[PDB]
């Protein structure tokens, strides 16, 4: 009944935002166009 | 074509819906004045030649 996780890695890039604060580079997406554009949903 | 994400309850699930739309031409002209004159039919016919 115990059971451990097994992961590989297959690193692809990708378009994204990259923005350093302080001493840590932080990530910055809006999620508007790429997600709940055009449906019935509230942004929460 | 509309894309949905999957919410859980209490509120209610929805189906994928879809849009079919008609647009009519609208149709317009243009109009120009190109007008002679009087002798210019001679000159170019060769009347007055």
């Given at each position: 009944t115990?059971?451990?996780?097994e992961?590989?890695?297959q690193?692809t ?6 923005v350093?604060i302080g ?9 508007e ?6 449906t ?5 | 074509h509309?894309?949905?994400i999957?919410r859980?309850?209490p509120?209610?699930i929805?189906?994928?819906?879809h849009?079919?739309?008609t647009k009519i031409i ?6 120009a004045?190109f ?9 170019l016919?060769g009347?007055?030649?």
């Amino acid at each position: 009944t115990l059971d451990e996780l097994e992961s590989a890695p297959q690193t692809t890039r990708v378009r994204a935002d990259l923005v350093s604060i302080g001493e840590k580079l932080i990530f910055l997406e809006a999620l508007e166009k790429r997600i709940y554009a055009a449906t019935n949903v509230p942004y929460p | 074509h509309q894309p949905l994400i999957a919410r859980d309850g209490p509120h209610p699930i929805e189906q994928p819906t879809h849009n079919y739309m008609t647009k009519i031409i609208d149709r317009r002209a243009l109009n120009a004045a190109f007008s002679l004159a009087t002798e210019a039919i001679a000159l170019l016919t060769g009347e007055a030649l």
